[PDB]
Structure formats: structure tokens, C-alpha cells
Design a protein around this motif. Structure first.
Motif, PDB file in Angstrom:
ATOM      1  N   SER A 147       7.096 -22.902 -30.835  1.00 23.47           N
ATOM      2  CA  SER A 147       5.863 -23.448 -30.577  1.00 23.47           C
ATOM      3  C   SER A 147       5.198 -23.088 -29.850  1.00 23.47           C
ATOM      4  O   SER A 147       5.269 -23.464 -27.546  1.00 23.47           O
ATOM      5  CB  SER A 147       5.372 -24.923 -30.458  1.00 23.47           C
ATOM      6  N   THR A 148       4.245 -22.377 -29.652  1.00 31.78           N
ATOM      7  CA  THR A 148       2.943 -21.780 -28.648  1.00 31.78           C
ATOM      8  C   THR A 148       1.525 -21.775 -28.425  1.00 31.78           C
ATOM      9  O   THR A 148       1.181 -21.749 -29.295  1.00 31.78           O
ATOM     10  CB  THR A 148       3.452 -20.055 -28.128  1.00 31.78           C
ATOM     11  N   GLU A 149       1.872 -22.624 -26.822  1.00 32.81           N
ATOM     12  CA  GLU A 149       0.155 -22.870 -26.640  1.00 32.81           C
ATOM     13  C   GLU A 149      -1.110 -22.709 -25.447  1.00 32.81           C
ATOM     14  O   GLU A 149       0.245 -22.256 -24.732  1.00 32.81           O
ATOM     15  CB  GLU A 149      -0.410 -24.264 -26.632  1.00 32.81           C
ATOM     16  N   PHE A 150      -1.947 -21.634 -25.924  1.00 34.14           N
ATOM     17  CA  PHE A 150      -2.271 -21.029 -25.031  1.00 34.14           C
ATOM     18  C   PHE A 150      -4.122 -21.974 -24.603  1.00 34.14           C
ATOM     19  O   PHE A 150      -4.642 -21.965 -25.514  1.00 34.14           O
ATOM     20  CB  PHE A 150      -2.506 -19.712 -24.931  1.00 34.14           C
ATOM     21  N   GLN A 151      -4.348 -22.315 -22.924  1.00 36.90           N
ATOM     22  CA  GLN A 151      -5.578 -22.723 -23.173  1.00 36.90           C
ATOM     23  C   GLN A 151      -6.673 -22.497 -22.370  1.00 36.90           C
ATOM     24  O   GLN A 151      -5.621 -22.628 -20.835  1.00 36.90           O
ATOM     25  CB  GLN A 151      -5.417 -24.227 -23.296  1.00 36.90           C
ATOM     26  N   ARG A 152      -7.316 -22.091 -22.059  1.00 36.86           N
ATOM     27  CA  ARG A 152      -8.215 -21.560 -21.097  1.00 36.86           C
ATOM     28  C   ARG A 152      -9.633 -22.060 -21.166  1.00 36.86           C
ATOM     29  O   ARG A 152     -10.342 -22.596 -21.682  1.00 36.86           O
ATOM     30  CB  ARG A 152      -8.483 -19.982 -21.505  1.00 36.86           C
ATOM     31  N   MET A 153      -9.654 -22.912 -20.152  1.00 40.69           N
ATOM     32  CA  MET A 153     -10.940 -23.139 -19.643  1.00 40.69           C
ATOM     33  C   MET A 153     -11.821 -22.963 -18.613  1.00 40.69           C
ATOM     34  O   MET A 153     -10.970 -22.271 -17.204  1.00 40.69           O
ATOM     35  CB  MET A 153     -10.980 -25.202 -19.180  1.00 40.69           C
ATOM     36  N   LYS A 154     -13.234 -22.749 -18.405  1.00 40.96           N
ATOM     37  CA  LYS A 154     -13.879 -22.122 -18.116  1.00 40.96           C
ATOM     38  C   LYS A 154     -15.310 -22.827 -17.043  1.00 40.96           C
ATOM     39  O   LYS A 154     -15.918 -22.747 -18.209  1.00 40.96           O
ATOM     40  CB  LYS A 154     -14.494 -20.276 -17.835  1.00 40.96           C
TER      41      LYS A 154
END
Lengths: 50, 50
Positions: B14-21
Motif C-alpha cells: 500500500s503506497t500513498e502520496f499526498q500533496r497539499m499546497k
């Protein structure tokens, strides 16, 4: 007529009487410069605002 | 990802990326100009002065 206006007029009269029309016209133009063209006979005292 | 082989060899991935800007720009420009001009009297020299 005021004293000064009468005096200037007398000076012009005397210059004319001396048969010297050159400084007569100069003196008359000085009269025009000092006392303007017209004489105010009526004003309206008041105030205004915009 | 889930992979089970032969009902014995299990595997999970299980691989998760998350970006918030976030960006914020705030500009204020206030200009003010006040200009008062009072003219009370006009003083002139009498034509008969020395």
C-alpha cells in the motif's frame, strides 16, 4: 468723488492746460491703472457655498 | 496491491502520496490627499501713497 480721484483728475487737467498732451495721456493711463475702468454703484453683500 | 499465491504466500503493498499546497497574496494601497486653500483679504497700496 474721493480726494485722491479728484487730485488725479486735477493733475490731468493741469497737464492738458499746459498744452502737453504727451504726459497727459500717460497720466490718464495711470488713472486707469489705479482706479480701473468702471465704478461700482451697487453690490450684493452675501455668501455662497458649493 | 494484494497477491496471494497457492493460498499460502500472501503479499500486500500500500503506497500513498499526498500533496497539499496553499498560496495567499494580499495587497493594499491607500492614497489620500487633502488640500486646503484660504484667501481672506486682498491688500493693495493706495494710489496716493509715498
Amino acid at each position: 468723488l474721493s480726494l485722491g480721484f479728484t487730485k488725479a483728475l486735477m493733475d490731468i487737467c493741469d497737464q492738458l492746460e499746459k498744452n502737453q498732451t504727451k504726459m497727459a495721456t500717460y497720466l490718464a493711463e495711470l488713472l486707469i491703472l489705479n482706479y480701473g475702468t468702471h465704478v461700482i454703484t451697487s453690490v450684493d453683500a452675501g455668501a455662497a457655498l458649493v | 496491491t494484494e497477491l496471494a499465491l497457492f493460498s499460502r504466500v500472501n503479499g500486500k503493498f500500500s503506497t500513498e502520496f499526498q500533496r497539499m499546497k496553499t498560496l495567499q497574496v494580499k495587497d493594499q494601497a491607500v492614497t489620500t490627499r487633502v488640500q486646503v486653500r484660504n484667501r481672506i483679504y486682498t491688500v493693495k497700496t493706495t494710489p496716493t501713497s509715498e
